[PDB]
Design a protein around this ligand. Sequence first.
Ligand SMILES: C[C@H](C(=O)O)[C@H](c1ccc2c(c1)O[C@@H](C1CCN([C@@H](C)c3cc(F)ccc3OC(F)(F)F)CC1)CC2)C1CC1
Ligand SMILES: Cc1cc(OCCCS(C)(=O)=O)cc(C)c1-c1cccc(COc2cc3c(cn2)[C@H]2[C@@H](C3)[C@@H]2C(=O)O)c1
Length: 418
Amino acid sequence: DLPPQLSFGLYVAAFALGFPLNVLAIRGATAHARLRLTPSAVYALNLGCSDLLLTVSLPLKAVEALASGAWPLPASLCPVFAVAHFFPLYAGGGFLAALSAARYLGAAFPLGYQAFRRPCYSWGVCAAIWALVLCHLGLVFGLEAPGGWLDHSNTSLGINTPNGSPVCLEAWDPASAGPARFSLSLLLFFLPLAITAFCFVGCLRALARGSNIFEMLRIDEGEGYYTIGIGHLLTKSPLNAAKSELDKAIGRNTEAEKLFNQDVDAAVRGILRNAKLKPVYDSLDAVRRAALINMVFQMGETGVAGFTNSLRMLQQKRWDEAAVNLAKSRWYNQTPNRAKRVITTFRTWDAYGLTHRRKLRAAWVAGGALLTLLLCVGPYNASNVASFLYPNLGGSWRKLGLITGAWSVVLNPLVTGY
Ligand SMILES: C[C@H](C(=O)O)[C@H](c1ccc2c(c1)O[C@@H](C1CCN([C@@H](C)c3cc(F)ccc3OC(F)(F)F)CC1)CC2)C1CC1
Ligand SMILES: Cc1cc(OCCCS(C)(=O)=O)cc(C)c1-c1cccc(COc2cc3c(cn2)[C@H]2[C@@H](C3)[C@@H]2C(=O)O)c1
């Protein structure tokens, strides 16, 4: 049991909210792809376009719920309501799976994806999304649905006539309506749901994997012997011999954090070894200790002990006087864009950006994308299972199911726009 006073009230309250925010969502992705041509902007704009398709179909579904299931527009427009309503209920999953995928790929693998990704590639995914759902629905509609080349009946296209008024699709024969709705859910929903979830997982795991000083030395650097990783020197002799030296160190054939961490873990043992630096490190900031390891990697324990006047000014807890003595040095003149970033960081992470926030925002797009699929689309998609397995259950479940599914239009743009 579901009263029409409530069903109409839910379908119009979701339309009054869905329509403008989607207009804000579309405008947002158009403005941000003009300024940069972002890969997930295509997903956000394409999600908005499909979302609004459902939004303008809500009044007709509100009037349908009013006329109590009965179809109130002519029979020649029901295959156009079906395509406008049920396409975004399945489509949304494919976009939020690629949108959340784009967010994860640039969270876990930022230097690889940035080089890989381009706009046209992302249009390719949506182009395959539009086609897939339009064909899966199209074929299931052109065959199984009442009024196709399978049902030899006088009843119009997608129209069922019970004594009463003609109803569009909802009055479908339970024996055939079940299996046709189950294949749509099984294929077009559980698989895009898995990627979104696995991406949200990966985004959480990209948060715990970062290291403040790595990002500080990634910006700083990036014999002249050919090697791999963030300064993790391979060998002095040339390449098949250098290859397995990297392969046996990680396990995988032919990540740089584990090799930087091990490199730094031993680099601290070198600072302790050099007695002229050891007291200074032990009295310094956790923040300022990383500004010293920056110079240690750059010059060595020789050059670090050489600047004795400035290091003593660091032991004496005087940052401003040491930074001036450091501003007039052979190192400052040698490396001009790196020196100053260490000097300002010694005196005061502010001087260094940029990765925490992007790994955090991307963990929140795929995080919200997971819950909009489990709170909007989800309950609906779960009824195409429960009604399929247990045929005794009434339309009261699916009516609320198609109601939560319709509240996708309000929830989905909030995910992308936060
Ligand atoms: C991030 C990359 C970029 O942007 O540049 C992009 C990429 C990489 C991985 C994934 C990327 C997209 O989309 C995810 C999608 C792909 C489209 N699938 C659809 C088409 C789908 C497949 C099914 F088997 C069943 C239902 C489906 O749902 C539907 F509703 F859309 F139909 C949803 C997952 C999976 C992971 C690369 C250019 C290719
Ligand atoms: C196949 C077809 C034929 C057609 O016209 C045939 C020519 C008309 S005539 C014979 O009068 O000349 C018009 C359209 C829009 C379509 C068409 C194309 C793409 C998608 C669709 C919409 O399909 C669907 C499919 C399902 C639903 C809704 N719409 C309900 C079921 C399964 C899903 C669900 O409840 O989960 C329909």
